[PDB]
Amino acid sequence: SVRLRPLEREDLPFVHQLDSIMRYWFEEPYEAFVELCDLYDKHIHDQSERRFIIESQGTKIGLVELVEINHIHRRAEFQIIIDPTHQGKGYAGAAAKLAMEYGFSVLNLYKLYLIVDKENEKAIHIYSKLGFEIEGELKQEFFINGEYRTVIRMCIFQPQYLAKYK
Amino acid sequence: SAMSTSSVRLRPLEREDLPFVHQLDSIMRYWFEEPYEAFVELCDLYDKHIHDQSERRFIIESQGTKIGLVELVEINHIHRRAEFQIIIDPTHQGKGYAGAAAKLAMEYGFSVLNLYKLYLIVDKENEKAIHIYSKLGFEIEGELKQEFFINGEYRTVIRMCIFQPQYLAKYKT
Amino acid sequence: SVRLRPLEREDLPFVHQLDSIMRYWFEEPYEAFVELCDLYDKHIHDQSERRFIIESQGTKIGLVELVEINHIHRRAEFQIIIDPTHQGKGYAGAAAKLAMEYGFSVLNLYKLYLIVDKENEKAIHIYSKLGFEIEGELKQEFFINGEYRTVIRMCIFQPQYLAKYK
Amino acid sequence: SAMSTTSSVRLRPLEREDLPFVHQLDASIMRYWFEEPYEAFVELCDLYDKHIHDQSERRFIIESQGTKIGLVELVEINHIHRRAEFQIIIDPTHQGKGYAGAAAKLAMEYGFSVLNLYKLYLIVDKENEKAIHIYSKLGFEIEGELKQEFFINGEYRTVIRMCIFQPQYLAKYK
Amino acid sequence: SAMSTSSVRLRPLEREDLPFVHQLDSIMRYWFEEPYEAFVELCDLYDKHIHDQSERRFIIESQGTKIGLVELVEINHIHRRAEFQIIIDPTHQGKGYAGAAAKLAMEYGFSVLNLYKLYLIVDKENEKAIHIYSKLGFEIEGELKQEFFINGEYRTVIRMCIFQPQYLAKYKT
Amino acid sequence: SAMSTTSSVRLRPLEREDLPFVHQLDASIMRYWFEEPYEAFVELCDLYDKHIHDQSERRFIIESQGTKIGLVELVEINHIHRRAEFQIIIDPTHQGKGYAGAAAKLAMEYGFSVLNLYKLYLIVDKENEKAIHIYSKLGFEIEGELKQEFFINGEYRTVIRMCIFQPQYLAKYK
Amino acid sequence: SVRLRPLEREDLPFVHQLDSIMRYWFEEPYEAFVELCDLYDKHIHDQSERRFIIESQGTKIGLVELVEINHIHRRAEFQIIIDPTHQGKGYAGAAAKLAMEYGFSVLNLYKLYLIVDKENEKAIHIYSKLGFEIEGELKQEFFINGEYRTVIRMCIFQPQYLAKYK
Amino acid sequence: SVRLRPLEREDLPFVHQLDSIMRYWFEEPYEAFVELCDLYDKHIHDQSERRFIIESQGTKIGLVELVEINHIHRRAEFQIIIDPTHQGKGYAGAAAKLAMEYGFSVLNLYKLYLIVDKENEKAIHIYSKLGFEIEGELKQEFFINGEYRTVIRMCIFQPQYLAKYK
Ligand SMILES: [K+]
Ligand SMILES: [K+]
């Protein structure tokens, strides 16, 4: 009984404290909370990204971000961030399921994909069990904490989903 | 060099290049990740984004005439990468301009912008472009499945990349 | 060898003279040319409607309007207007084919539909031969020239199109 | 290990609510926000609002044990040339405890490991041998001497420009 | 120093100092060469001119309480000069604050602003101020005749000046 | 005297109609207008409008015999510290004729005698011995060497900073 | 020991309640308090009119208005309004003296004038004793409470003032 | 038969070419013509300065600038600039007379003053003959062409003028 609800202004302090590492709101960087607030106001009607607070038993446990929503090509990227204090309880996989529900059954998308660090085998395994296939290995794609990291792109499609989970 | 495609250069895109840009193509086109069809839309977006350094464009010209466009997009200086696309006017295809311009795009990204990685996306069935980029030193990193709906069907694309070390070796001994 | 190209500001005088009867630009009425110009400027980046000049042998012969584009429900309405001087040559059906091509193969829509007067059997027949089924009869839906007219809504879907014309 | 000696000095992104702290870190010496001068608090606030999305400067409050002890400013961030200047200001009430050097290390970590810069540099008064020595021990080499470059308190002062590069850092601190 | 007027300093004017400013005085007063009477007018002008460096203001404070104002106006860095005025709250007159503050104003103009000349204007019949400024090293440069209409009559003013050499001598051995 | 040899090289204030000339003085090296980058002509025009009353930079067309031969840029004008950087650009078609040195003299005249500055300085590539020599003969002393300070054409270049002061000028050229 | 001080926003409620009869702020009419506030904001730096609260023993007793200030011709009109609860105590004449002081000794004007109803002999007498001569009788110049009223214009000049009161 | 007329936008190119030395429009510096144009637009209704083209026989021969107009203290500074090609013909003194006429007889000022270089005895003599007395010697008041110059302030008053020239 984990669910998604739309991000609201009053959720930003929660968002700000989920993490040193660049964060992006509508492809625009922010560090300070004030910067995040300003960007949140500036992009309020932009449908190219959508965000949801993940909540269980009324407490806020993480964030879902769909970004690069494109309805002509019918795809979006998604990212799940779980509050460090609620990690290791399979909320990530529960929320990934909800993100899939939303993208395929409300937004009418054909493809969802995601990016994870090559060395995050735990997440790679979770996404493989949910039905995601690996489509790409982006080499040295992000400079993080002094070193270039490699990421795996993974994807799933709307027919295989509206079968296996519907 | 002397008896050959020799005089190809790049210059910064200017407002008066837009009619040329508009006529290089059926297919959604994007200016700073914003769609346009009409020329008027393209003009408006061009004005709106004039100081944004996240994309940079160059007209390819040879013998004084405009023959194509280079687009570097998603320029990110923290990760030190960019995507690029070379578009050759259909009337100037088959004269080796794509590869000539690709070399100039690489020069610019690695030697002026100080990037570490450049990459590009091409249709899996664009063997001509795939071959050109393999000869220039690009390795294949990714096959993005059914990533674009074009002319009624989902197409698959190849992502290809080259890094600033392999470039400042292979073209800078 | 009839084709579609995107409407440009310089096409508005042509648009204005294709017709006494209310005309709409982004669901906003206009009569005078100046009103049409102003609305054209005001809505330039709005993707909820798209327009194309139909041209053959370099001369302008009509207009295609897709309106109420919705990418979540994946549909749009379309209207073909042929210049009175180029009617009776089957440009309407040629342009309807191009509108179908565009909506289904570029925009990735699932359903296109259109509205025609119940008494326009000639147009109803053309659209039936192109594969459109009748979905509705909207009774007394428009007051035109002193009387309430009834319209037929007709639709076609993207799988039957990407078979029969692809 | 349990038996280390370690400081809990850290850096966090500057916020609007940090400005009163910033303002009172120094009427006597011109201070600049995005290369624009300010004296009054009101002027600082206005400039802070005006420059909020500009990435050419980045600021961090230095804090230890949860209290605010200073400010780090990286300015003239240029990602094509891959460099930045930095300035450390330590609150006068927390001077003499090696926080400057501790914060300089954190500034280096951030510039080289987050921002992906190749060169960091700083400016100090030629007569500040204590600071010059600290920066020499952290790995900074002297690159030059800007003569009579600032009029401060009635006299033209000379400054030393010191620098460290991304290779010498990802060696000496890894 | 110990048993004396000792703790006088200058700090930058802030918005919350304006009520104090407004009540230091019959006489037109100017903020960035623009007149005001009402407090509301002063507030509005204060906002309107916040980043203008052609004037700079400091509250004079002693023992933590606000005792006056320093105004440097017509700051010109090409000619390297400024005019200044010291205003002491009437309730803190007769304690040597004017001369203490004048010294601080001189310090600021010559040692922080890098000015070559500071000058001031006082009524010809303000012998008290004339005397203080003569002792601080100011020479008389000008007698401006009937230069201000004040309280029904045309008053004559003395312009006085000191230069950056005579200052960084007399107060900086 | 009638029998002098003299150039009619002068400086006049940059105008909007000079921008096409400016634009074509150099796709290969980043150029800056009020510390803001531009490549396209349109971008240059926009920045020119946006900064028209800003006195922190001043520009002059160098002209001789009524034709435009180059540009002088004084940048980072600071009147509290009483200094400015300057850059001379000579049109490639008018190089090798000592206009750089002639224009540098005019730039000095203007900075010291109109702007009332105490220090002027400039930056040149360490490997440009020809320019270094010219500036040494005009009275500029070397103040330092900024190491690997610019990424240009695939490599990190080192620059020399050179300076002259208002006393040494109002001696040597009066 | 009655004095003048500059009108401030917080004096407007007092102003509004000193009076059915049109009132003007910078030659613009108002009835409601909100209208007065808006006009007060709109005209804050306009030196063509100046206003002063008349106060005695710290309580607000009336208003002085100088209007049509013209510094080339060196004149202004003034009006004294006394709160009805403080009338009949010669505050009007005390305030008129202060208005004269201000106009002639601070503003450097050459002529001040005022308008009063022809039938207000009490005010006419006060102003005659202060040195004002009658310059004009404006016939049927104001419609007030159903009838056209006639007004007397009265004036005094700066030399006769800087003699007789200085 | 030299006269004054109000400065107009179309006079700016003439103004720009009368002169290396800082010039001011409403106390704001300009060098380029574009800067002068922009400032001219920005200050069009500001009465604190007024400018007049001096013209004789229909050709433009110079400029009069009244600046720091203050109507409470009833004074202004003025500057005469004569085009170098029309110097040495006593247009300066003719224009100074017109500036006096305007300031005292139209603007109703009490005092006009001017600033000239101490070493410009020719101008000092002209102004002494017109009735100006020296009021001040401002020492090292302007840095010009590498050196600090000293200026003489000179003034004349409205009663002595409306006698001697009226
Ligand atoms: K700087
Ligand atoms: K700089």
Short mmCIF file of N, CA, C and O in Angstrom, two decimals, chain E residues 123-170:
data_model
loop_
_atom_site.label_atom_id
_atom_site.label_comp_id
_atom_site.label_asym_id
_atom_site.label_seq_id
_atom_site.Cartn_x
_atom_site.Cartn_y
_atom_site.Cartn_z
N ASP E 123 27.72 77.01 5.78
CA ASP E 123 27.28 78.38 5.86
C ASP E 123 28.46 79.25 6.33
O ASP E 123 29.22 78.85 7.18
N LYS E 124 28.63 80.41 5.72
CA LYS E 124 29.67 81.40 6.12
C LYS E 124 29.64 81.76 7.61
O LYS E 124 30.65 81.91 8.21
N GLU E 125 28.45 81.88 8.17
CA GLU E 125 28.23 82.11 9.60
C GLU E 125 28.24 80.86 10.49
O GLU E 125 27.88 80.94 11.65
N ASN E 126 28.64 79.69 9.99
CA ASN E 126 28.83 78.48 10.84
C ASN E 126 30.31 78.40 11.27
O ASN E 126 31.06 77.50 10.85
N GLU E 127 30.71 79.34 12.15
CA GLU E 127 32.11 79.48 12.57
C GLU E 127 32.57 78.25 13.30
O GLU E 127 33.72 77.85 13.16
N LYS E 128 31.66 77.60 14.02
CA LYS E 128 32.03 76.39 14.77
C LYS E 128 32.53 75.33 13.81
O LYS E 128 33.64 74.80 13.99
N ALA E 129 31.76 75.05 12.77
CA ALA E 129 32.20 74.07 11.75
C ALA E 129 33.43 74.56 10.99
O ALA E 129 34.36 73.79 10.75
N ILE E 130 33.46 75.84 10.63
CA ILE E 130 34.63 76.35 9.92
C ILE E 130 35.91 76.11 10.72
O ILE E 130 36.92 75.74 10.14
N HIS E 131 35.84 76.32 12.04
CA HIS E 131 37.00 76.19 12.93
C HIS E 131 37.44 74.73 12.97
O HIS E 131 38.60 74.42 12.72
N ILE E 132 36.49 73.83 13.21
CA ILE E 132 36.79 72.39 13.25
C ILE E 132 37.51 71.95 11.96
O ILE E 132 38.52 71.25 12.02
N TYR E 133 36.99 72.36 10.81
CA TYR E 133 37.57 71.93 9.53
C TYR E 133 38.91 72.59 9.29
O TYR E 133 39.80 71.96 8.73
N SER E 134 39.11 73.82 9.74
CA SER E 134 40.47 74.42 9.64
C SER E 134 41.49 73.68 10.45
O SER E 134 42.58 73.41 9.94
N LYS E 135 41.12 73.24 11.65
CA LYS E 135 42.05 72.46 12.47
C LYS E 135 42.34 71.08 11.91
O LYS E 135 43.40 70.56 12.15
N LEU E 136 41.41 70.51 11.17
CA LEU E 136 41.64 69.22 10.53
C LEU E 136 42.50 69.31 9.26
O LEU E 136 42.92 68.27 8.75
N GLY E 137 42.78 70.52 8.79
CA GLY E 137 43.69 70.73 7.66
C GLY E 137 43.02 71.21 6.35
O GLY E 137 43.68 71.22 5.30
N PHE E 138 41.73 71.58 6.42
CA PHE E 138 41.01 72.05 5.28
C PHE E 138 41.31 73.55 5.04
O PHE E 138 41.26 74.32 5.98
N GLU E 139 41.60 73.92 3.81
CA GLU E 139 41.81 75.27 3.35
C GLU E 139 40.48 75.73 2.69
O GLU E 139 39.70 74.93 2.21
N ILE E 140 40.23 77.00 2.67
CA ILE E 140 39.01 77.59 2.12
C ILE E 140 39.26 77.74 0.65
O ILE E 140 40.23 78.33 0.33
N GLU E 141 38.39 77.27 -0.24
CA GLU E 141 38.62 77.50 -1.68
C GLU E 141 37.68 78.46 -2.33
O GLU E 141 37.94 78.94 -3.43
N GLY E 142 36.59 78.80 -1.68
CA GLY E 142 35.50 79.45 -2.40
C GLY E 142 34.49 80.02 -1.45
O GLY E 142 34.22 79.40 -0.40
N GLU E 143 33.93 81.16 -1.82
CA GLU E 143 32.82 81.73 -1.13
C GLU E 143 31.65 81.86 -2.14
O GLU E 143 31.66 82.75 -2.97
N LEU E 144 30.69 80.95 -2.09
CA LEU E 144 29.58 80.95 -3.05
C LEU E 144 28.44 81.84 -2.56
O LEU E 144 27.78 81.55 -1.54
N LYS E 145 28.22 82.95 -3.28
CA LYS E 145 27.41 84.05 -2.77
C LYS E 145 25.95 83.76 -3.01
O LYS E 145 25.55 83.47 -4.13
N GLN E 146 25.16 83.87 -1.96
CA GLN E 146 23.71 83.75 -2.08
C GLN E 146 23.29 82.47 -2.82
O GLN E 146 22.42 82.50 -3.67
N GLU E 147 23.87 81.35 -2.40
CA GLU E 147 23.80 80.09 -3.05
C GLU E 147 22.63 79.23 -2.57
O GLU E 147 22.26 78.30 -3.28
N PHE E 148 22.06 79.51 -1.39
CA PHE E 148 20.91 78.80 -0.88
C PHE E 148 19.89 79.73 -0.23
O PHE E 148 20.22 80.52 0.64
N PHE E 149 18.64 79.64 -0.67
CA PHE E 149 17.50 80.26 0.00
C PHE E 149 17.03 79.38 1.14
O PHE E 149 16.51 78.29 0.95
N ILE E 150 17.26 79.85 2.35
CA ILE E 150 16.92 79.10 3.57
C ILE E 150 16.18 80.02 4.52
O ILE E 150 16.62 81.13 4.80
N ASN E 151 15.00 79.57 4.92
CA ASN E 151 14.20 80.30 5.90
C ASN E 151 14.08 81.77 5.52
O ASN E 151 14.31 82.62 6.29
N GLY E 152 13.74 82.03 4.28
CA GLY E 152 13.40 83.37 3.83
C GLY E 152 14.55 84.24 3.39
O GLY E 152 14.33 85.36 2.95
N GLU E 153 15.78 83.74 3.49
CA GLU E 153 16.93 84.55 3.07
C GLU E 153 18.02 83.77 2.34
O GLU E 153 18.19 82.56 2.53
N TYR E 154 18.71 84.48 1.46
CA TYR E 154 19.79 83.93 0.66
C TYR E 154 21.04 83.86 1.49
O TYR E 154 21.50 84.86 1.93
N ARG E 155 21.59 82.67 1.70
CA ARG E 155 22.78 82.49 2.49
C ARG E 155 23.98 82.25 1.64
O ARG E 155 23.89 81.74 0.56
N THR E 156 25.13 82.61 2.15
CA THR E 156 26.41 82.47 1.48
C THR E 156 27.14 81.31 2.10
O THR E 156 27.02 81.09 3.30
N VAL E 157 27.83 80.51 1.28
CA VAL E 157 28.52 79.31 1.79
C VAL E 157 30.00 79.35 1.45
O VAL E 157 30.40 79.99 0.47
N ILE E 158 30.77 78.65 2.28
CA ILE E 158 32.19 78.51 2.14
C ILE E 158 32.39 77.12 1.66
O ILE E 158 31.93 76.17 2.29
N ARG E 159 33.12 76.98 0.57
CA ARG E 159 33.62 75.71 0.15
C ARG E 159 35.04 75.51 0.75
O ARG E 159 35.89 76.39 0.64
N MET E 160 35.28 74.35 1.36
CA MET E 160 36.59 74.00 1.95
C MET E 160 37.08 72.66 1.44
O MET E 160 36.29 71.78 1.22
N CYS E 161 38.39 72.52 1.27
CA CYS E 161 38.94 71.31 0.74
C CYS E 161 40.26 70.89 1.37
O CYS E 161 41.01 71.70 1.88
N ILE E 162 40.52 69.59 1.29
CA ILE E 162 41.78 68.98 1.66
C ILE E 162 42.17 67.94 0.58
O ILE E 162 41.31 67.36 -0.03
N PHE E 163 43.45 67.75 0.33
CA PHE E 163 43.91 66.81 -0.68
C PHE E 163 44.61 65.55 -0.12
O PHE E 163 45.04 65.54 1.01
N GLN E 164 44.69 64.49 -0.91
CA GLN E 164 45.18 63.17 -0.45
C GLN E 164 46.64 63.19 0.02
O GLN E 164 46.93 62.58 1.01
N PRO E 165 47.55 63.92 -0.64
CA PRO E 165 48.88 64.23 -0.04
C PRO E 165 48.92 64.89 1.37
O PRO E 165 49.46 64.28 2.28
N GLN E 166 48.33 66.08 1.55
CA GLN E 166 48.23 66.72 2.90
C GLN E 166 47.55 65.83 3.97
O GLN E 166 47.88 65.94 5.15
N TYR E 167 46.62 64.96 3.58
CA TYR E 167 46.06 63.97 4.51
C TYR E 167 46.98 62.80 4.91
O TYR E 167 47.14 62.53 6.09
N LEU E 168 47.50 62.07 3.91
CA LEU E 168 48.44 60.93 4.12
C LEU E 168 49.83 61.47 4.58
O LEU E 168 50.79 60.71 4.66
N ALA E 169 49.96 62.77 4.86
CA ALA E 169 51.08 63.36 5.63
C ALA E 169 50.66 63.56 7.06
O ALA E 169 51.01 62.73 7.93
N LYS E 170 49.87 64.63 7.29
CA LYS E 170 49.32 65.07 8.60
C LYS E 170 48.65 64.00 9.50
O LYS E 170 48.57 64.23 10.70
#
